[PDB]
Design a protein around this ligand. Structure first.
Ligand code: CDL
Ligand code: CDL
Ligand code: CDL
Ligand code: CDL
Lengths: 61, 99, 50, 37, 133, 68, 119, 65, 119
């Protein structure tokens, strides 16, 4: 049970100046309004999981 | 769980000594006869067995070797073929396997 | 517990309740330590007074 | 059988033709842990 | 007789080091610092020294992970993350630009509460109007 | 010695290597900082059985014997 | 027994035991190591352990069994074939009598009936 | 221990968890007089093995050797 | 409930779990740290958690509850007494509904019947 709860991924900010591709790409990105759908888990950012396509560059140790 | 964990079924007494940990005694340990006493005791059994327990031995060994087989149908075959037509229950009483 | 709970497991209840004190002066001490480290970086490599 | 008894409950041959649909399940050697630093 | 003038000399140097460690270090290294190595060598001392401290900081964080794992109900034989058995290891980011451009360490300050939390304040604005505030 | 039978099981050290035993003919040597291969370069899957203690076997021989 | 050319890699991995071996597909790269000319149909290369068998025959036809078959491209095919059928025989038996050991089996972690929940 | 079927996380004998540790013998005379390392050459086969040669002496006389 | 003065320590240790606590006998040494004079009978010092209770009473009679009871010899007795009855209450319940957890119970590792061996 403790392991299962621990896999529910947390929310990780998209803003990233440490990876130079995002340091360039995020300057041309358009911040659009995220309209609330009635939930508390809207993944409007990336997820803190090593296997996420937007967090694979982050080292989870 | 602790790696050095053991469950013992008989009593043991541990030494209360500094820098050492061991079993110093066993409760209610009786010292049997010495090796020289059991030796003499056994020599008397082997001596009588050497003088008075060698006649009619070849037959009993065949019965004992037959009863060491896996299946009963092979034992009966062993007795009829090697022991000169011996009976299963009659030989089991000679060897002491019957109640 | 029967309807909305899990198995009743035995655990040791720690009465000591730790909590890191969130202070102000602790960061002042931290800056001073780094200020000494940065000054040494300047004292050894960026000192031209001799 | 051959002078040997192997006690077993009554066998139900109907268990042979039991509908068991195969469900997807993948194992990932190399995944996620519980906590990370 | 022994040399009574050298008595308590190690203590006296310690008290001067504590009083002014940068001045004690500066003057004790003046003659050695007359010979100044190149920018490359100085940069290697600093880089390798800090890179060693960075890994030590990660080793401390992993020790806290093992303590939490211990408290969560998993006993730990041995120590460290250099798994002798059939497990995957992760050695630590090689301190060379190749890996420092592809990888970056997990910043804990980027893990946030979902902003949907702020939508519960809508209840307050509606209650204030219901109560006539 | 022949090339070990292809085995996809491996253990990473520094980065995920995505080892594919079918991508190369001969298996390259394992470097400490790259990969560790599975155990049993030349091994097969069999079934074995522990041998019960001698004194326990003798009690079973006595029961079967006293049974028949 | 496998009644197809392809099998899901996970269906032959253990769920409650460490996975130290896989059951990989035939190594087609070994087919291009044969220096001599040969005719092989693609319709026979995917079935388990057969490609290594045909390669062994091709090598035993071009060369023999003495001082010419003893070359690395031909001995690895004989070893792969002897090894492929041994593992597949063991995995096949383990699948027949120990299906609860593998991933995908519903008995590896049995799902309880609703009457066992007490609702 | 790994070959015997026990996977090992970590390494060494400095058990982080709830286990007894056994540090190396302190290289001082106090401990060098109370302790000494296990000499493997002192673990032997029981000499009762040599009593099986009694069968050989009896078979030789049975065959008239 | 324990219906005696003495209990086997192994009977209160776990067999399939790590042993991080014991159920020790009363600490008779704490009784000699009370500086004042008191009457204690040896027939009441072995029963679980009662010694720490009588000591707490002796200390609450000589001193009170304010500025004089707050001394190490008296607070440790109150803490021991409060902790002893809590641990014994949990161990007693665990012994009542989870006897299979402890050493000495025939259900911690059940011995099978001879009908299950197939002989
Ligand atoms: C019945 C009830 C009562 C029973 C009582 C029983 C006990 C009896 C008590 C009496 C014991 C002493 C006997 C009389 C001694 C007479 C000898 C003498 O004439 O003086 C020699 C000695 C000579 O010194 P010196 O000639 O001036 O110069 C020293 C050298 O020049 C060296 O100068 P240096 O600068 O080069 O430094 C080197 C220095 C060593 O320098 C060091 O580097 C050691 C530093 C140790 C401190 C650090 C420890 C690490 C952890 C702390 C970290 C601190 C960090 C600080 C910095 C911040 C962090 C960066 O060398 C020494 O170690 C000197 C020690 C004396 C030499 C003896 C040979 C020792 C070898 C083995 C030493 C091992 C222990 C070392 C501890 C040293 C403590 C001072 O003088 C003294 O020792 C004065 C002692 C006065 C003590 C008064 C006590 C009165 C009685 C009260 C006792 C109550 C105790 C209650 C206990 C209860 C139970 C727990
Ligand atoms: C092999 C390396 C291994 C590593 C070893 C590491 C050793 C531990 C070091 C840890 C470093 C702590 C950082 C402290 C930050 C200080 C910043 C600073 O600017 O210091 C100037 C500062 C002097 O400026 P000041 O404040 O104006 O004091 C002059 C007054 O005249 C003073 O009045 P006065 O002259 O009339 O009094 C006599 C004089 C001589 O007195 C003595 O030396 C005897 C006393 C020694 C006692 C043992 C000290 C043990 C460690 C410190 C105490 C515990 C932690 C304190 C926390 C400090 C940080 C806030 O007093 C002093 O020298 C200064 C007082 C020393 C502090 C005593 C009071 C401590 C409690 C203060 C609490 C305030 C903060 C609140 C608590 C914060 C907690 C969150 O020096 C100090 O106060 C102490 C610094 C000690 C640093 C030792 C570093 C040793 C070398 C490290 C290795 C680096 C090697 C690099 C080689 C490179 C080669 C190229
Ligand atoms: C450690 C030894 C083994 C242990 C046993 C020790 C036995 C007892 C002795 C203990 C004491 C040994 C003393 C060693 C230190 C040197 C002694 C000395 O001064 O001799 C005169 C020496 C003068 O040099 P020179 O040879 O006469 O000619 C210099 C000419 O300019 C140009 O000369 P050149 O053209 O002919 O050659 C160029 C360059 C030669 O090129 C190099 O030196 C290569 C440097 C590449 C970078 C290496 C980084 C060191 C490793 C750091 C990593 C952390 C440690 C653990 C991780 C590594 C794992 C192995 O010259 C040098 O750098 C001279 C130093 C070479 C020998 C010593 C090098 C030690 C390297 C590390 C050894 C392995 C570490 C094992 C530690 C194990 C710990 C468990 O003094 C110096 O000034 C040079 C020292 C190096 C410092 C450079 C400037 C650093 C500036 C940074 C400022 C940062 C400020 C921070 C302030 C903090 C706040 C307060
Ligand atoms: C109109 C003309 C243009 C105007 C130019 C104006 C220039 C104004 C100069 C102003 C000078 C500032 C005065 C203060 C300097 C004090 C700081 C200092 O570093 O002195 C070292 C000082 C002097 O060093 P030195 O031993 O005399 O050697 C100097 C020369 O190397 C000589 O010794 P060498 O002959 O033996 O050296 C041979 C050289 C041989 O080099 C070569 O032959 C070819 C080099 C090609 C390099 C290939 C680059 C490939 C890059 C690949 C990148 C891949 C990854 C990129 C990823 C990006 C993201 C995608 O190899 C080296 O060792 C080079 C030294 C390293 C230089 C690093 C910077 C290189 C870029 C230069 C930018 C300027 C370009 C101007 C255009 C010139 C066109 C002709 O020595 C010290 O150790 C004391 C201070 C140490 C402090 C260390 C802290 C360093 C960081 C903080 C410093 C302060 C702030 C930053 C300042 C900028 C520093 C880079």
């Amino acid at each position: 049970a403790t392991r299962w709860y621990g896999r529910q991924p947390g929310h990780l900010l998209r803003a990233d100046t440490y990876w130079i591709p995002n340091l360039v790409s995020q300057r041309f990105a358009k911040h659009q309004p995220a309209h609330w759908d009635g939930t508390q888990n809207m993944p409007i950012f990336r997820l803190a999981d090593p296997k996420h396509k937007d967090s694979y560059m982050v080292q989870f140790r | 769980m602790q790696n050095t964990t053991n469950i013992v079924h008989v009593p043991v007494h541990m030494g209360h000594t500094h820098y050492f940990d061991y079993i110093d005694s066993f409760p209610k340990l009786k010292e049997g006869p010495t090796l020289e006493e059991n030796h003499i005791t056994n020599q008397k059994i082997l001596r009588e067995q050497l003088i008075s327990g060698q006649q009619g031995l070849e037959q009993n060994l065949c019965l004992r070797n037959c009863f060491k087989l896996s299946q009963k149908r092979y034992i009966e075959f062993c007795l009829d073929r090697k022991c000169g037509g011996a009976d299963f229950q009659r030989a089991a009483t000679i060897l002491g396997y019957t109640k | 517990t029967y309807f909305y709970g899990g198995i009743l497991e035995f655990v040791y209840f720690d009465k000591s309740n730790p909590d890191m004190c969130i202070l102000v002066h602790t960061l002042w001490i931290h800056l001073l330590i780094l200020f000494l480290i940065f000054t040494g970086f300047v004292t050894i490599l960026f000192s031209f007074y001799g | 059988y051959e002078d040997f008894v192997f006690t077993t409950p009554y066998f139900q041959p109907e268990s042979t033709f039991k509908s068991v649909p195969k469900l997807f399940s993948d194992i990932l050697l190399g995944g996620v842990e519980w906590v990370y630093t | 007789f022994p040399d009574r003038g050298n008595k308590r000399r190690w203590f006296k140097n310690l008290f001067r080091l504590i009083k002014n460690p940068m001045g004690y270090i500066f003057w004790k290294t003046y003659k050695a610092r007359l010979a100044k190595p190149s920018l490359i060598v100085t940069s290697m001392f600093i880089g390798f020294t800090l890179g060693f401290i960075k890994l030590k900081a990660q080793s401390i964080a992993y020790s806290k992970k093992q303590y939490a794992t211990l408290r969560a109900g998993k006993n730990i034989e041995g120590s460290g993350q250099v798994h002798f058995g059939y497990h995957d290891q992760k050695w630590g980011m090689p301190a060379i630009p190749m890996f420092q451009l592809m990888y970056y360490e997990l910043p804990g300050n980027s893990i946030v509460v979902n902003p949907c939390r702020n939508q519960n304040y809508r209840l307050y604005f509606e209650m204030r109007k219901k109560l006539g505030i | 010695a022949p090339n070990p039978y292809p085995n996809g099981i491996h253990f990473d050290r520094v980065f995920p290597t995505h080892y594919d035993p079918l991508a190369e003919t001969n298996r390259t040597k394992a470097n400490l900082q790259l990969i560790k291969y599975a155990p049993g370069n030349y091994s097969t899957l069999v079934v074995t059985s522990e041998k019960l203690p001698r004194p326990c076997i003798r009690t079973i021989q006595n029961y079967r014997r006293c049974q028949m | 027994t496998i009644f197809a050319e392809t099998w899901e890699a996970s269906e032959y991995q253990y769920r409650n035991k460490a996975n130290l071996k896989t059951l990989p597909v035939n190594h087609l790269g070994k087919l291009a190591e044969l220096k001599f000319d040969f005719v092989e149909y693609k319709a026979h290369q995917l079935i388990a352990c057969h490609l290594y068998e045909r390669m062994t025959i091709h090598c035993m036809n071009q060369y023999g069994l003495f001082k010419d078959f003893y070359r690395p491209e031909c001995l690895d095919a004989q070893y792969y074939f002897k090894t492929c059928v041994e593992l597949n025989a063991a995995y096949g038996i383990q699948k027949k009598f120990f299906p609860e050991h593998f991933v995908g089996s519903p008995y590896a972690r049995p799902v309880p009936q609703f009457q066992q929940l007490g609702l």
